[PDB]
Design a protein around this nucleic acid. Structure first.
Ligand SMILES: [Mg+2]
Ligand SMILES: [Mg+2]
Ligand SMILES: [Mg+2]
Ligand SMILES: [Mg+2]
Ligand SMILES: [Mg+2]
Ligand SMILES: [Mg+2]
Ligand SMILES: [Mg+2]
Ligand SMILES: [Mg+2]
Ligand SMILES: [Mg+2]
Ligand SMILES: [Mg+2]
Ligand SMILES: [Mg+2]
Ligand SMILES: [Mg+2]
Ligand SMILES: [Mg+2]
Ligand SMILES: [Mg+2]
Ligand SMILES: [Mg+2]
Ligand SMILES: [Mg+2]
Ligand SMILES: [Mg+2]
Ligand SMILES: [Mg+2]
Ligand SMILES: [Mg+2]
Ligand SMILES: [Mg+2]
Ligand SMILES: [Mg+2]
Ligand SMILES: [Mg+2]
Ligand SMILES: [Mg+2]
Ligand SMILES: [Mg+2]
Ligand SMILES: [Mg+2]
Ligand SMILES: [Mg+2]
Ligand SMILES: [Mg+2]
Ligand SMILES: [Mg+2]
Ligand SMILES: [Mg+2]
Ligand SMILES: [Mg+2]
Ligand SMILES: [Mg+2]
Ligand SMILES: [Mg+2]
Ligand SMILES: [Mg+2]
Ligand SMILES: [Mg+2]
Ligand SMILES: [Mg+2]
Ligand SMILES: [Mg+2]
Ligand SMILES: [Mg+2]
Ligand SMILES: [Mg+2]
Ligand SMILES: [Mg+2]
Ligand SMILES: [Mg+2]
Ligand SMILES: [Mg+2]
Ligand SMILES: [Mg+2]
Ligand SMILES: [Mg+2]
Ligand SMILES: [Mg+2]
Ligand SMILES: [Mg+2]
Ligand SMILES: [Mg+2]
Ligand SMILES: [Mg+2]
Ligand SMILES: [Mg+2]
Ligand SMILES: [Mg+2]
Ligand SMILES: [Mg+2]
Ligand SMILES: [Mg+2]
Ligand SMILES: [Mg+2]
Ligand SMILES: [Mg+2]
Ligand SMILES: [Mg+2]
Ligand SMILES: [Mg+2]
Ligand SMILES: [Mg+2]
Ligand SMILES: [Mg+2]
Ligand SMILES: [Mg+2]
Ligand SMILES: [Mg+2]
Ligand SMILES: [Mg+2]
Ligand SMILES: [Mg+2]
Ligand SMILES: [Mg+2]
Ligand SMILES: [Mg+2]
Ligand SMILES: [Mg+2]
Ligand SMILES: [Mg+2]
Ligand SMILES: [Mg+2]
Ligand SMILES: [Mg+2]
Ligand SMILES: [Mg+2]
Ligand SMILES: [Mg+2]
Ligand SMILES: [Mg+2]
Ligand SMILES: [Mg+2]
Length: 204
RNA sequence: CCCGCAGAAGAAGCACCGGCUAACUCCGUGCCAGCAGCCGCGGUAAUACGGAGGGUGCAAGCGUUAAUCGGAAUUACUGGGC
RNA sequence: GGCCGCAAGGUUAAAACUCAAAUGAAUUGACGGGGGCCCGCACAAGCGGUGGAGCAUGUGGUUUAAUUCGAUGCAACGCGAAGAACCUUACCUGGUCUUGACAUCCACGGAAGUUUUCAGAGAUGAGAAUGUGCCUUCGGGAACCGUGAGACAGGUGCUGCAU
RNA sequence: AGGGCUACACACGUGCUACAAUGGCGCAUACAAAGAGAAGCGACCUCGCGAGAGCAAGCGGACCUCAUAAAGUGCGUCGUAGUCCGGAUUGGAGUCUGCAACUCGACUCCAUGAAGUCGGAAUCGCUAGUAAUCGUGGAUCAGAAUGCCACGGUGAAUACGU
RNA sequence: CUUACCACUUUGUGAUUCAUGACUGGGGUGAAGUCGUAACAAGGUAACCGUAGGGGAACCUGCGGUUGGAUCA
RNA sequence: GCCCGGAUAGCUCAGUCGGUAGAGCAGGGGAUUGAAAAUCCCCGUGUCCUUGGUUCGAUUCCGAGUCCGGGCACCA
RNA sequence: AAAUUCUAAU
RNA sequence: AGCCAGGAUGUUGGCUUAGAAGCAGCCAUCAUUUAAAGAAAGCGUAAUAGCUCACUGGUCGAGUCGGCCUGCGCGGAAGAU
RNA sequence: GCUCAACGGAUAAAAGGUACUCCGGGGAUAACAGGCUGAUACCGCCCAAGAGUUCAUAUCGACGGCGGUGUUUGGCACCUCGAUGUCGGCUCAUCACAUCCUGGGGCUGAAGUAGGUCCCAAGGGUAUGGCUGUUCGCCAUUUAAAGUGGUACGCGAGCUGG
């Protein structure tokens, strides 16, 4: 079904130096909940918040049944209380933003299967004498699925050009796929997180 | 226009009640929902939001929006200043 | 945009948008690494300590079924507590009760109390003798008991930012 | 009814005892103030190494009890060593209060004998019968103070100055 | 029939006005971020004006000017 | 493809001369402050890139391998 | 003679 | 080898899922009437239904079905005056 | 008394450029083309885990295997250095079939229109432009279709010279 591990990250919203304290308190709450469930919590990224807790904490929770119970904590959490960084005795309202995202794999494959490649061999252009004329040293590879084209005529040997262009095509495919995944994840996190403004909230 | 007929028989709504501005209490929500012409209300004991009871102002009308003059001596001839 | 200048630029001179203010003089305080005059074991001169060690005690944190609650700059921390084995105790686990542990009202059968026996961790439940009197117009009423309903009791529950 | 507030990798505050010779240990002997006492204070005598136990007068108290003050002084030993300093921790046997001392009391005897050899950055109290040091009593309380509130003994150094 | 005037229409080259344009320069607004502390007291180097150079930024320095500057027992 | 150089704490980096590894920043505890910085005191390091070998003993010496940095790849 | 800072509801 | 006939009984099974009934996939794979019939070799239904095959009686009437050691041939076999 | 280590040691004593070049030779030796080969390139076939809702072979084919051609890049250095002119375009062609269209069929997860795949077949036919010196390639608009290759990767005693 859906019981995979999860990533929990909380960051400050409105308030500044006291939203960091509330983020620390909220992280401590979640950590104690995880500990009294036979789960495991480990901190990957921490940005301390000058006075108190963390301006942003990103940790990974691992167990059986994690995401199925922590997927409802993604949103805004509002706190109304007397801050520690308060000379007078005023009550202040602040907020924090929480994001919970499931753990998903990173299956990457060498999508360089030659059954879906078009290879063109032709003559290079430049100054090479009577040998550059009567030889097919320039190479070009077109990837049928993605549609990327890479052409190479660096060295006099066709095999070196073929290898170099094949490596460049693989690198370009990898970069495109990684950029796609990164933008999808960023958009999902942006929609899940919200914008800490003490007016969009899930609990008080 | 005049006379007769039957029966009170056929005929009341709109805005507002914190100050400016005449007119107050209860319940619901809890910087949310909402109100506002200017100051400004609402953070779990709200005469300012929503409903009820009461009151105030106009009335076959009542309110809102647009436009002009006045207040504005705020282009100062009457009648201002450095 | 125009004029002037080698250039740096000068000169004439708007609009959109945004706020409900911006400003001058003086007034009462507060503050100054501004100026004078003073005081306090506040500095200076001395004496003895604390921070190091072992132990007592309180607090934070952590743990736990609970580790009850409050104070938590100077002005909280041998503080409320002028004294936690049971009690205190307000916390946790388990076993129990519902006008009721603590008061008044109404009705019904009752002197109050003394010795015991069985079951249970105890709360409690069941059983048997024992005294059945005290002012009482011999109508009765009354210190005090159990039951039956409800007006009510009960709260160390929250708000010291309503008092 | 039983348990917890007494937990324990750690951090802080307030204190008690020490790190020794201006001292430790043994023998002998001087000088206080204040306070409490009836389900209470408890003398004498006897038993026990000791905490204590048995019998038991007096006292609602300038009369009786708690209740020998200690530091001090005289003599002797220790002779600078982790020691005849230090008294933590642990094993065994007991006394008392309390129906009930395992978690969780106080005291006693025997055995044991840890850190500690004067304390980093820092920081606290005190101007005279004060600081320092030595003993005594009371409230709470069946039992349970190094805490709190009081009482006396010995008794200093320093203040050019703001 | 022919000539003159002239409407529609056509050609070339300018002016002005409206919308739009890849990039680029500043301006305003913000109940929370990063870097410092330039000004308000002598604001800890008195402040400001004109000008020139420099620098992540408030700003610093050179020349002239002003008091709309504190202390002066 | 050939040649040279490098790999050491969390990050930038010195060092062996075959037996015993350091510096700055950072990190932990405590001081000063109403509080955060600056400042002061105390405290901790790492299988010296992977693998095989010689040695009593390898971070060091000798073979391979991975990654990083630099140079060259000309006449037709 | 040294010496930076104090967000956001009374 | 052709040709007639059978090819049955409580598995609508818990297992698994909306239904999986011989035939989606997972374990097992016994028993009964029999001359024979798999608790199923194949086709087919959303699941049923439906049609064949293993095995067995009848006709027929004499040979028939697979391996081994070897000789020679076939396919696999498309290029530029 | 020499790392005369270029170790039978040329002098005690010594680096580079030539696209401004020049002489004597070599196909004893490279670049173009031909030749042998076929690592590479391209095209077929064998077995069948599997994908195809179920079903290996409608259409694909993992792990492996066996061949063909002489279009690419190579290996060798057999011909040519007393000379075989080298890319692209133009004009003109000619052959192979591993067939782009038209022609005849089998199977389809082929209802029809349209397709997929494999056989037979070489008679005829098989674009104009933008960009670039371009071969190659991208784009615009047509066509029944805009085939793949050999010929010194055809064709300069036929043209041009980017
Ligand atoms: Mg060249
Ligand atoms: Mg060639
Ligand atoms: Mg009024
Ligand atoms: Mg209104
Ligand atoms: Mg209300
Ligand atoms: Mg209302
Ligand atoms: Mg109202
Ligand atoms: Mg006017
Ligand atoms: Mg007006
Ligand atoms: Mg005026
Ligand atoms: Mg201008
Ligand atoms: Mg100039
Ligand atoms: Mg003003
Ligand atoms: Mg003023
Ligand atoms: Mg002053
Ligand atoms: Mg002053
Ligand atoms: Mg004094
Ligand atoms: Mg002093
Ligand atoms: Mg200590
Ligand atoms: Mg507490
Ligand atoms: Mg105290
Ligand atoms: Mg208790
Ligand atoms: Mg009060
Ligand atoms: Mg409080
Ligand atoms: Mg109890
Ligand atoms: Mg306690
Ligand atoms: Mg007395
Ligand atoms: Mg001793
Ligand atoms: Mg003892
Ligand atoms: Mg002893
Ligand atoms: Mg002892
Ligand atoms: Mg010593
Ligand atoms: Mg004294
Ligand atoms: Mg400043
Ligand atoms: Mg300064
Ligand atoms: Mg300055
Ligand atoms: Mg200044
Ligand atoms: Mg400068
Ligand atoms: Mg200047
Ligand atoms: Mg100046
Ligand atoms: Mg620290
Ligand atoms: Mg800052
Ligand atoms: Mg402030
Ligand atoms: Mg053959
Ligand atoms: Mg031929
Ligand atoms: Mg030689
Ligand atoms: Mg030689
Ligand atoms: Mg030459
Ligand atoms: Mg020559
Ligand atoms: Mg030759
Ligand atoms: Mg050749
Ligand atoms: Mg399948
Ligand atoms: Mg050839
Ligand atoms: Mg060849
Ligand atoms: Mg040759
Ligand atoms: Mg040879
Ligand atoms: Mg030849
Ligand atoms: Mg010749
Ligand atoms: Mg030649
Ligand atoms: Mg031929
Ligand atoms: Mg054919
Ligand atoms: Mg065809
Ligand atoms: Mg066909
Ligand atoms: Mg033909
Ligand atoms: Mg023919
Ligand atoms: Mg013919
Ligand atoms: Mg030919
Ligand atoms: Mg040619
Ligand atoms: Mg050709
Ligand atoms: Mg000619
Ligand atoms: Mg040329």
């Amino acid at each position: 079904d859906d019981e995979r591990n999860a990533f929990l990250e909380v960051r400050a919203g409105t308030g500044g130096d006291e939203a960091a304290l509330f983020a620390g308190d909220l992280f401590r709450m979640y950590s104690r909940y995880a500990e009294a469930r036979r789960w495991r919590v480990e901190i990957m990224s921490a940005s301390e918040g000058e006075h108190g807790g963390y301006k942003e904490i990103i940790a990974k929770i691992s167990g059986d049944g994690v995401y199925g119970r922590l997927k409802f904590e993604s949103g805004g959490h509002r706190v109304q209380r007397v801050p520690a960084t308060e000379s007078q005795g005023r009550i202040h309202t602040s907020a924090c933003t929480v994001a919970v995202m499931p753990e998903l794999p990173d299956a990457e494959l060498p999508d360089i299967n030659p059954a879906d490649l078009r290879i063109d061999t032709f003559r290079s252009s430049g100054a090479g004498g009577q040998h550059v004329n009567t030889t097919d040293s320039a190479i070009r590879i077109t990837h049928l699925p993605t549609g990327i084209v890479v052409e190479c005529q660096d060295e006099r040997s066709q095999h070196k050009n073929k290898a170099k262009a094949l490596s460049v095509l693989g690198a370009r495919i990898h970069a495109a796929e990684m950029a796609k995944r990164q933008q999808a994840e960023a958009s999902t996190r942006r929609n899940l997180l919200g914008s800490g403004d003490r007016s969009d909230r899930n609990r008080t």
